[PDB]
Amino acid sequence: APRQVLDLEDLVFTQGSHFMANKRCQLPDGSFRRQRKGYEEVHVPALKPKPFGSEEQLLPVEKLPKYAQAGFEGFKTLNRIQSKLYRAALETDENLLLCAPTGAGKTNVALMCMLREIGKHINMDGTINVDDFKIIYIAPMRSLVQEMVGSFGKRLATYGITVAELTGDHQLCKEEISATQIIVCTPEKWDIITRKGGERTYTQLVRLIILDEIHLLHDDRGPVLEALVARAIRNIEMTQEDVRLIGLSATLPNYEDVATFLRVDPAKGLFYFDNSFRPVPLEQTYVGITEKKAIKRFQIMNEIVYEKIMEHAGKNQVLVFVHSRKETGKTARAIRDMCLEKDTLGLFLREGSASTEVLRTEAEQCKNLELKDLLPYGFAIHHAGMTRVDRTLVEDLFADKHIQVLVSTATLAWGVNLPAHTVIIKGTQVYSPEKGRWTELGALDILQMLGRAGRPQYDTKGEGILITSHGELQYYLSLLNQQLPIESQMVSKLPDMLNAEIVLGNVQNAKDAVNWLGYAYLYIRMLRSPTLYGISHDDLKGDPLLDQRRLDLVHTAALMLDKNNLVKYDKKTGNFQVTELGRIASHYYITNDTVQTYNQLLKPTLSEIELFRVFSLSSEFKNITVREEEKLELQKLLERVPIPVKESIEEPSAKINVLLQAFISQLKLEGFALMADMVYVTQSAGRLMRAIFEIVLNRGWAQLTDKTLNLCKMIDKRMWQSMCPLRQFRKLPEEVVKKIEKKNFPFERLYDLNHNEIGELIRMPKMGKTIHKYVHLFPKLELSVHLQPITRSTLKVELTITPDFQWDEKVHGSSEAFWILVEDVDSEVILHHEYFLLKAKYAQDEHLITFFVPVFEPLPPQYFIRVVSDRWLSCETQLPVSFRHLILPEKYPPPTELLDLQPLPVSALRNSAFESLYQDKFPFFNPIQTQVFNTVYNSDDNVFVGAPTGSGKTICAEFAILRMLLQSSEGRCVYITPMEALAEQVYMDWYEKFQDRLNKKVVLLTGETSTDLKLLGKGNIIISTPEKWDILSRRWKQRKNVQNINLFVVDEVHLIGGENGPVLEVICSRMRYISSQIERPIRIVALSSSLSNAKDVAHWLGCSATSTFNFHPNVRPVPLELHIQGFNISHTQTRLLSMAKPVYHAITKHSPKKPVIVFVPSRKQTRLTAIDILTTCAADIQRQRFLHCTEKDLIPYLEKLSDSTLKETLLNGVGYLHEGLSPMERRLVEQLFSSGAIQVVVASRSLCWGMNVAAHLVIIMDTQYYNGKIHAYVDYPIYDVLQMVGHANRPLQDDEGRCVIMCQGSKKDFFKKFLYEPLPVESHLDHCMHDHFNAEIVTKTIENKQDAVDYLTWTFLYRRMTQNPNYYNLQGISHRHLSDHLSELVEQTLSDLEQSKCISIEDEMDVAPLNLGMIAAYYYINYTTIELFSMSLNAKTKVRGLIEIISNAAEYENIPIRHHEDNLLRQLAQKVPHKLNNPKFNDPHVKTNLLLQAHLSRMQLSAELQSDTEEILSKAIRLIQACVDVLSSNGWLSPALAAMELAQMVTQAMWSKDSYLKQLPHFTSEHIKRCTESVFDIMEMEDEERNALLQLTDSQIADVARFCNRYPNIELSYEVVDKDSIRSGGPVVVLVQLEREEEVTGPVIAPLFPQKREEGWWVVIGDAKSNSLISIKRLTLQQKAKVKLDFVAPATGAHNYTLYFMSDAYMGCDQEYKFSVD
């Protein structure tokens, strides 16, 4: 559409607050003019009290709601206005606009609104619900902010409510917000907060916003209120969460438009009370001065003031407002010296001089200043240059009616409520630093000042006098008489406001901006007064929505923003692109011109002089000039300030410069204009310097980062770097510090001196101890670095940060912030940086910060790591990091070239039954599959395929499997994936593709060993995870089906570089070894992500170079488009929230019509992010835009879902996937996503391996997750990210994939490295060595230290050690170094294994398995775990003790601690049978203990705790069985039996002492107390009273029936062979026999136990008195078994024994037979 560049200087209201659209001004009632020839006097009488309306009453506090009476104490009766508003405010949620006269007591109105909100959260149980809500009170003045905080604090204190001011800071704001229910603050402050884009972390709980002095709209600051409200309203649209707006305004024209602006219903929430509703009727007098001359005008003024004080003698109190703090005393002195006169009126004011209050004001002469002179006369002064004691004194003496005449500053009017009867305002002229001139006093100030006239309980009438220049009388008449119209200044600030809305992402283009302007006060005002705003009535008539004017305004502003490089704007499409300068400009609230200035002048080599100059050139200061009259003082100041102000003479630039230096130096000033200018530059200075800091930090300029950060800290602490750091402690006597400075010696030394030596050094021996204290209060960090080379271009750094200093809540508060800076050898460039927060609770703990730095092969000597405080001056530490001794890894070879072969057809596979698996899906294989097709399908040799996830590597493995099936139809193939999820997917796919169609056997290995051996027996294709195949193939010497396998396929072998990688490496190695120790070679096919060193993997696995295919990530068949989006927010919650809008924009930009997966860190974020995508969609007025079916069509599917929110989001086209959903529900959401019915799915990270789903676009929402064990957020494994990115692939539908990674900025570089380029992997087996060595020693593959050294040579470790020595901590790549290092490895491993009694070492060479080592190898348990068992187990060990011991296993170390899990585990700790002693709830072993007890009690838990419980239960059995073996091996009966009982009761999920009938499904608790029992005697199988005593389910009859046909049936015979022929010391043989009725079909049935187990039994012989286990055997039943138990007989042959038969599965099946021997 046509755009016109406007002249904005034409359309703006120049006069700002002083602008009057007003034409005439009509004076109320009778009114009159008196011409005194020095001036004219206009009188306006009080207005009469309009009679009451029908059903209207002043409303005593007793009548307003119960809970609300508190806070209103001290008030017996609500004010008239307040009474009319009390129903609207308290009983409705409607938005209100209240226009009231000055003085109307709006505080109580706002308070009623607040009390309405608070009243929802009453929480009748306790006091209040504090964390459910937040209230925001916006006030225009800092003084008023402080006042309101005090007031609301006192009045609401009864409700247990925190009310607080918001003081400008990065972090302290964040957590002081969280603790605060009522935040009081200024418009631009809340603007700065809600600009940050992660704004919702502050605003999400805000239910109420009160705008005080909303007529500020008319002021030059008004556009801030416009931005605030526009933003809030639109956000209410987008979150669908309601927020109430309350405006409070003066009585002025246009108020109905202000009502429209705030969206208040005129018939509901609009209340306008004219001046007559004022609670104290006000008489007005307007003086104005005829002509221009000098002192005569001021003399006239003083005369007016005196004449008017005189008319109130001992009668009333007079408050007089002056515009300077020195003028308070000047005028108050002038007036009482004018009171001497002819015959003195000097004290007519207290003629109550019979000493009354007269000696109260004269007893108060213990005071200071000008007060001491004035007070005994009843005169006083009030300003901000006084002190809280003197100001409180003046206020108190004026409130007690002691002080009669009080002269003061506006600060009093805003800051405290103290009305006088009479108010005189002198001159209405005030200095404005930002306008740089003297100007007419702000309208808000006049209103607030005259609002102090008359005292609500003390006065029948109030009075006020406004002394002004004669011209300008009509303005103040207009203002106070309700004729000065409220207009919109938005045109003035439009470009900055537009930029802020672009940065937030609320405006993506010109059209969005037009719609945005539609929310502004400007839109309404332009509609209703087009001519005033420069619009033709013709235009308006043809364009009622002002499309043209809005588009023009926006075009103009966008050209301005584009010019100054805050935004990229093309005039054709009208799209906007945020820039970094724009983002900083918005965030730090700096004007766009300033940003262009900084961007021009800022450079890496900028000096400090030039830095001060650049700051001085900020456009915030553009109206400042140097006056002649202040020149001299500037000169003096220039002399005492340290930084040269270069030869710029006094132009404004140098004036600003010197004023800032002087502020830093704390020089005192005289000139009032010079002082005002100083306060103005310096209050802005912190923000501006912080902006320059962020610019240069993010550009990587080290020197200027240091300078600017320093300047920030200097401006905040008001001291130069030159001075003593101890100045930053305010409690330190300043001459002690000056003493320290004058000594001239490094501050650093002070650290190492004792207090005696310190006091000695400073010549102040008395002070040495305190100074020592403060030296050690000063924040200090110690730094440790650990270098691991990754590639020739990349090093990994672990920075260990150790706090060395004493924390003080008074000094350091809740946290301390630092910057980690990684700089080059010349300290000119910041190579890496990140924010680091040291929290108070986590102090004294070490912190580990991991990051990656670039290096360049002509390697420097060193880099530098500086850790620098964000706040404190001269608080820093530097760590050199030396590259001298570094060995860069070996250059990795080029990737395999992708040759363009013809896209080979499915027919090249020559078997048609094979081709029927493919031809339906596709005609041709992709380039990766064609290039490799010959080698894998046609050859027999080992092959490596590297390629980006989604290159279709799986059917390469399928090629190999088909060839195997051609070679031998009975052949055996084993397949390995690191992930169980991957295994199950591959299982479903390959079961269909092989077992169904090709009719071979396809099996998936399970937890249990025997059934897995059985499956390995049956299997043509065997799917497994590494540990399952590990426990299987350890015994390969004795297992031939392990030996004979035709094909070994290992998938995702790059996972060797990850956690659990060592087991993968070990089993692959073992397979290579087996292959070379036997006749018929086992083939190896390895599939991987693109690896930088593929050769090492290939060689390791036996692949020739021709059989090695390693493809670069950019040859991925469906080309990927990757975008990495950085967010500089260290706080994860805030970062996540700030990602919400980028997620949506990513969807609508990169994949508007096509399917989209969004991955999020956690369960709750799935739901949240889905709901956001929902509401945001709806708020583009495009809803169901992601629903590509009819809502009706889904219903039959949605009825199958349990989750309400999921039903709702699915109705809108957005599904989600988290661990809390059932497998069915998950499959359902997947099916719906795949069919294209829903366009968007949001999945938690834990499901990324378990999703069979593809998208056009994958969005990764953050990269980090909480680790509660280290109390920190940690990064995603690169493998998870690679899989996730791999999910955007659709070869049939799409011509490309698209992926957007949104991560913390400090992480961006990392992802640019290991995503675009191929991934290096290393081995971690050298930290895992013990269990594997132990295993191979138990099978006697390692018989000695040489055997160990040779075992290592089959590993990937062996290859990588000479490739990247420094990574493994080798000091050379030589064979000498390799042999040495491997020898130390072998040595320490074998030694540790011996100390744990796992192995035996003879002659320092030979090794042998001991008992524990064999246990650990058999049950697959870590050596430290069985070592621990053997140490903690004894003859006295019981059930409780056994649970406590097994929970302490090493397997359970890896149980995670999630965010705020300590609370939930504390509550769970209170709900369990066994209390834990002083438990730490971030302890995974405590957690597993509690979850074990939880599982026994059948307590249901959160989804995460449930999955954790699953993982625990999996290995619980093997741990228990190990305890049994250890316990019996020591010959202890009772604890072993206890262990068996624990095994049963862990399997069936029931406790030790309880009804045995709980095993039967659906039976619970109080169901029946029926008989008062045993499932064996309950089943004499009857038919019986199942009707009579039960609660009768139809389904559970079938399930219980299914249980009893499974549930163990057993009877036992035994003979001890050759009874009495056995005599002492000789063999005793007890033969036991198991034969059964109702033979076995199916596994053990244990619904609550996750894995599918086998029945197993212990036949035990023991003496039940001496607690001696005399013999033991373990077996399985099936049909029949023979059981022989042999043991040695004692002397004196009368001896009595016991025979126990116990299960591992069920309870109640235990049997005992007593007997006798010899």
Ligand SMILES: Nc1c(Cc2ccc(-c3cccc(C(=O)O)c3)o2)c(=O)nc2n1N[C@@H](C1CCCCC1)S2
């Ligand atoms: N001009 C006054 C202002 C202006 C003003 C413009 C931009 C801002 C501002 C900008 C950024 C952040 C904040 C923040 O709150 O963090 C604030 O703050 C103010 O905020 N508070 C007061 N102001 N005047 C005083 C009274 C003192 C006796 C004489 C009459 C005025 S109280």
